Amino acid sequence: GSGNGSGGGGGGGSGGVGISTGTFNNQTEFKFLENGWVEITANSSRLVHLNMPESENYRRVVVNNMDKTAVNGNMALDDIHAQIVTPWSLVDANAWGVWFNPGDWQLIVNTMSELHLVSFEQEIFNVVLKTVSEPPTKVYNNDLTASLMVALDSNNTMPFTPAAMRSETLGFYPWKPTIPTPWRYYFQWDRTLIPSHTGTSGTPTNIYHGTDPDDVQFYTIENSVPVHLLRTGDEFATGTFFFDCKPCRLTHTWQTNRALGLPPFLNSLPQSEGATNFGDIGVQQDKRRGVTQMGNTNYITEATIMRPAEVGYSAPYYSFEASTQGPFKTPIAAGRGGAQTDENQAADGNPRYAFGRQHGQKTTTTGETPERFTYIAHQDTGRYPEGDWIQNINFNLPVTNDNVLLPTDPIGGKTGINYTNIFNTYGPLTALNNVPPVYPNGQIWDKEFDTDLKPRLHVNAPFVCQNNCPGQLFVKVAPNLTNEYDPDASANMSRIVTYSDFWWKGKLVFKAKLRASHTWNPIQQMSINVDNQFNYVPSNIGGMKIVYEKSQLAPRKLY
Amino acid sequence: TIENSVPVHLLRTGDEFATGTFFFDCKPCRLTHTWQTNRALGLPPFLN
DNA sequence: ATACCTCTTGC
DNA sequence: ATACCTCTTGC
DNA sequence: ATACCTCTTGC
DNA sequence: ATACCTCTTGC
Ligand SMILES: [Mg+2]
Ligand SMILES: [Mg+2]
Ligand SMILES: [Mg+2]
Ligand SMILES: [Mg+2]
């Protein structure tokens, strides 16, 4: 029935028991420079809460949903894999929402034309630790001398696990607390699994072989980073980090192979208004001057005519490939979009995000179903397979069935397939763009692969750091023991129930550039209205939510 | 033909020949291998 | 005594 | 008197 | 350590 | 007071 004793505070220049060590700031600054450059500084802070780990051990676990895949035709459902599980927790902040609110986004997006990522740093403070002790009256006392541990993997020794890919970054609301996630990482494993269908006879091999001892790697924080111990008075801070990576644009393109170059001169123009009064080239298709890449005909049509190269490309879908560890969907860059979609035509390439209350779902809404959406980029660089086709070289037309392959004809005798599903047109002439950011649920920057050769882009984030990326930040509560402890014993050790709270504050800097009017007509711009109006404000209860928004609004020539 | 394109040296027993030293311009080669496949990239799922 | 099919990675 | 959709490859 | 809804009554 | 799996983007 004691308060513990209240203990007394000694005082240095950067801290003590009853001395704050930090300052809260989650404010965003725009600073206009000469020539239309802007320096955007975004501050962000949060109160973070964290419990002691389940157990102070590292574990090696295997996951096995064999049963589900055992089904036949449920290949895609495979979740098998191995992983190391640590006692540490990770503080990840890589995600649009952590840093900006809508108002901000708006601005950026409407007035700028390109954006560069500059630097970033973070710090922790006002640390606090309390212990629970318990008729179920729970009491809480500060444990003045206990500690919080912190480690920053600046060397990037640990494997990299961006958490946004699972919606586990921090929260997006400055005024409400949040937490870090428990850290874990992939551990190697061999695995086989033969695809099958409903109609498939017997049991296609489906097994977990084990682990290529060659491929083994087991890391630990303890052995690789220096751990800091903070007490309340303590505080920690990373330096400032600078990024090396390309800029990101905020404009989208729209021309496709069809709109490149000099359109054909029309010998004949309409003479009155009306949406049926077309113009006419006025020349026999087989009599026109110009250039093609087709040696046989004399036809020259908007679809035949030569273009300098090729925007976009086509690839297989839905493709699953498989290697040593099981199958996985083959990614695309492009996505699709347009008039012939409307989220329902929604296909391959468009990404889809799913998430919780901490990241956008309405706070007050009950029921644990995740909120979702499919981002549909503005950039018209994807494909409409249905429109594709292939024909015989003789090119005698109108064309015969025997000389043409359609998205309609079935391949391999399977009805619901056609060449477009296994087609691929990437090649030296291909040209395209990087994905666009996705607010607020998009990852912001990402690490590059350590392969000898490399992707030309990643699909999860727009900024890929060329060199090293900022090291991960882990934390964890220091074990607080009871008076009984026998390491020699097999049992798990008992600890005092302990937990901690601390504030975290970060600063992320971008640099961008104002855009300027070039066309006569105005352009698209994000804006509020009666329809969405409520998405941007709390409910009479404090309901909040963050809807997704687009990014590359304005157009730009492609050529 | 060699004859038309290089200079030929004639050595007798007493003779001897030597090339200069040549320096390479090319990437390094690593001696480590990777093992993760698309399946092992990133944050594994949290196990409840 | 090796430099991107000559002389000439010289001068 | 042409520089990456302005002024402005200026200053 | 308060200046006209940011940074910044700073520099 | 984060640099490309150590010390060490130090010296
Ligand atoms: Mg260091
Ligand atoms: Mg190092
Ligand atoms: Mg082996
Ligand atoms: Mg292997």
Side-chain angles (χ1 to χ4, degrees), chain A residues 235-274:
Chain A
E235 78 100 30
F236 166 97
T238 54
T240 291
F241 184 101
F242 295 90
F243 294 93
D244 183 0
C245 39
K246 312 177 167 193
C248 173
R249 316 167 78 158
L250 304 186
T251 48
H252 69 261
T253 50
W254 64 254
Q255 323 171 331
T256 61
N257 276 52
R258 278 289 275 279
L260 307 188
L262 179 73
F265 169 64
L266 312 192
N267 276 309
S268 181
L269 309 182
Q271 278 176 306
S272 50
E273 296 186 326

Side-chain angles (χ1 to χ4, degrees), chain A residues 190 211-215, chain B residues 33:
Chain A
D190 275 317
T211 306
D212 184 4
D214 304 322
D215 307 331
Chain B
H33 69 261

Side-chain angles (χ1 to χ4, degrees), chain A residues 78 80-81 83 160-161 165-166 184-186 188 215 217 325-328 450 452, chain B residues 27-30 32-47:
Chain A
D78 185 28
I80 282 191
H81 68 258
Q83 76 176 51
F160 184 58
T161 52
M165 147 216 175
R166 300 207 125 117
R184 54 220 187 237
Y185 58 94
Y186 287 115
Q188 195 275 344
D215 307 331
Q217 290 172 169
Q325 309 161 152
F328 58 93
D450 194 6
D452 292 338
Chain B
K27 312 177 167 193
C29 173
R30 316 167 78 158
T32 48
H33 69 261
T34 50
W35 64 254
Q36 323 171 331
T37 61
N38 276 52
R39 278 289 275 279
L41 307 188
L43 179 73
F46 169 64
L47 312 192

